[PDB]
Amino acid sequence: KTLLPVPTFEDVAIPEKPKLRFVERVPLVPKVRRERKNLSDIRGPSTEATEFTEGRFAILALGGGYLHWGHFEMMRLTINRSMDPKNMFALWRVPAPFKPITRKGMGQRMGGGKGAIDHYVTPVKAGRLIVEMGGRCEFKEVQGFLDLVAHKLPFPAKAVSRETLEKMRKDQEERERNNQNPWTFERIATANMLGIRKVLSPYDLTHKGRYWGKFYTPERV
C-alpha cells in the first residue's frame, strides 16, 4: 500500500532518575499556625505552570481542585510501573502538599475554636499541569496509561501534548472570533448592561462567566 517516514528522536535527552520522586506526607517544618482556607486559591484560571518546561506530555487540570497525599501516591505508583525508565521520564509540576486543613472530632458542638491539623494539601487551579512527561515516546502510549491517572484525580483532567494543547487553545480563541450571536458575556459584564453587575461577582469580569465556583466550562466561548 503506502509507507510513511517514522518520527525519530535523535534529540531525546534522558536524565538519570526518570521516575517520580517521593513526595512527603507532611512538610519538614509543620505549620504551627492554623491557616484560613482561601477557597479563592482554587477559584478561576491558573497563572503559574500554564506551560511546559522540558517534556512534550502532561496531565492537564480541567477543573480546580485539592490534591492531597493519597493522590500523589496514586500517581507515583501508577506512572512509575507503567513507564519504561529507559525511554521516558516524568516530572512533578506541582509542589508537595503545604496547606493545612483542620478538623474537629465527632460530636462537637459548633464553635469553641478552630480544630487541629488533619491534612496537608496542594491547591490546583484549572489550567495547570500536574505531571510533565518527556521522552522518545509517541503520545499514544503515554496518553493511554496517563488517562488512567487523570481520571482518578479529584478534578476533571486530561492528557495532552504540545500539539494537542495548542490545538485546543487555538480552537478556543477561534470559537470566540467566529461567534454568531452579538452578545458575549464580556460585552455585558464590562458594560454593566441590564445592571447585571448586581447579580455578578467582581471576579466574573475576568472569568467572563467561563469559571464558576471551582469548575471550568470550556464550552463557554
Partner: peptide
Amino acid sequence: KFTRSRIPDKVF
C-alpha cells in the same frame, strides 16, 4: 461586596 461599578471608556 456589591458596588457602584463603572464603565471602561471603549464601550462608548
